[PDB]
Amino acid sequence: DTLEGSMAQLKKGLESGTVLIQFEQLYRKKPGLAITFAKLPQNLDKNRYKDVLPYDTTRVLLQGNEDYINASYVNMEIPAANLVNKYIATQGPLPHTCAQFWQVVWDQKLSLIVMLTTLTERGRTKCHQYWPDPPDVMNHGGFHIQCQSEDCTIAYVSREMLVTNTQTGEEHTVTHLQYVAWPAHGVPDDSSDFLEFVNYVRSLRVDSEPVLVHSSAGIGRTGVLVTMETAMCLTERNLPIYPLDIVRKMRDQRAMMVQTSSQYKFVCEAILRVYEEGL
Amino acid sequence: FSAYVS
């Protein structure tokens, strides 16, 4: 079909209720994909949640280093535009997985981290603080970490981090964006802040280079973000948007992305919004 | 260990 047609269908499917029914039909995990390393004894407590585990085939491996991390490569192709948006989708680091987290950032010299969670919710820890408050310095896995600046806006915090390999003295800089107005299992507190945020992340991409995206589990809020960025790329190029196909393609790479029907409904309505704005 | 979906 066309962008125009796909959007008529989405509009009708949201009134019809069929869009949600089909979302609830979709598999959460791709059947037949091995999940083995994540379940080994030495790796079980490296998972924040027992039911959110990487597939063997797309799990992130550390360079020259056997340590397991709950993280997955998620690549979203738009072939009609010779385009691939790369991500690494991961959970919120635990106290004892911060070393592996920063090792991924260093291995691939990732310049952008997107964190879609507060550190705590209702008196419970959702993510370990894996960076120091300025001006303090932090040791993780043989990396020294400092926050060179920190600025709060309405919906998110923008931080610049310096990562130093202690043995070599080689330095790497990373932009860190923490979206604090988006509860676990829910939708963004404000759709317009969300859409501005997503477009901002797009503008900070460097081609070829994955964006590291995480929340608490790294599937619900991360899935919504990935869906929306994909839809934005498609709408600007007058290409058809089928959100169910987008969700499935993510779930083929990390199970359960986009967690709730409310999240899916949210992102579909946001997709329609942006389409109506673009003409 | 806890489940996220719970």
Curated annotation (Swiss-Prot), chain A:
Keyword Cell division listed: no
Keywords on record: Cell membrane, Cytoplasm, Cytoskeleton, Hydrolase, Membrane, Phosphoprotein, Protein phosphatase
Keyword Isomerase: no
Active site, renumbered: 215
Sequence ranges assigned to domain Tyrosine-protein phosphatase in this UniProt record: 19-274
GO CC annotations, alphabetized: cytoplasm; cytoplasmic side of plasma membrane; cytoskeleton; cytosol; plasma membrane
Subcellular location: Cell membrane; Cytoplasm, Cytoskeleton
Superkingdom of origin organism: Eukaryota
Molecular function via GO: ATPase binding; cytoskeletal protein binding; phosphotyrosine residue binding; protein tyrosine phosphatase activity; sodium channel regulator activity
GO aspect biological process, one term: regulation of sodium ion transmembrane transport
Residues annotated for substrate binding in this entry: 184, 215-221, 259
Family as reported in the entry's similarity comment: Belongs to the protein-tyrosine phosphatase family. Non-receptor class subfamily.
Functional summary from the UniProt entry: May act at junctions between the membrane and the cytoskeleton. Possesses tyrosine phosphatase activity.
Name of the protein this chain belongs to: Tyrosine-protein phosphatase non-receptor type 3
Covered residues, full protein: 628 to 906 of 913
UniProtKB/Swiss-Prot annotation, chain B:
Tissue: Ubiquitously expressed.
Compartment(s) of residence: Cytoplasm; Cell membrane; Membrane, Clathrin-coated pit
Post-translational modification: Phosphorylation on Tyr-4 is involved in the internalization of EGFR. Not required for membrane translocation after EGF treatment or for targeting to coated pits, but essential for a subsequent step in EGFR endocytosis. Phosphorylated on serine upon DNA damage, probably by ATM or ATR. Ubiquitinated.
Superkingdom of origin organism: Eukaryota
PTM sites of type Phosphotyrosine: 4
Segment forming the signal sequence: none
Function according to Swiss-Prot or TrEMBL: Involved in cell growth regulation. May be involved in the regulation of mitogenic signals and control of cell proliferation. Involved in the internalization of ligand-inducible receptors of the receptor tyrosine kinase (RTK) type, in particular EGFR. Plays a role in the assembly of clathrin-coated pits (CCPs). Acts as a clathrin adapter required for post-Golgi trafficking. Seems to be involved in CCPs maturation including invagination or budding.
Assembly and oligomerization: Interacts with SGIP1. Interacts with HGS; the interaction bridges the interaction of STAM or STAM2 with EPS15. Isoform 2 interacts with HGS and AP2A2. Part of a complex at least composed of EPS15, HGS, and either STAM or STAM2. Binds AP2A2. Interacts with AP2B1; clathrin competes with EPS15. Binds STON2. Interacts (via its SH3-binding sites) with CRK. Interacts with SH3BP4/TTP. Interacts with ERBB2. Interacts with FCHO1. Interacts with FCHO2. Interacts (via EH domains) with DAB2. Interacts (via UIM repeats) with CORO7 (when ubiquitinated at 'Lys-472').
Domain notes from UniProt: The EH domain interacts with Asn-Pro-Phe (NPF) motifs of target proteins.
Associated disorder: A chromosomal aberration involving EPS15 is found in acute leukemias. Translocation t(1;11)(p32;q23) with KMT2A/MLL1. The result is a rogue activator protein.
Name of the molecule in the record: Epidermal growth factor receptor substrate 15
Gene field: EPS15
Boundaries of the shown chain within the full protein: 846 to 851 of 896
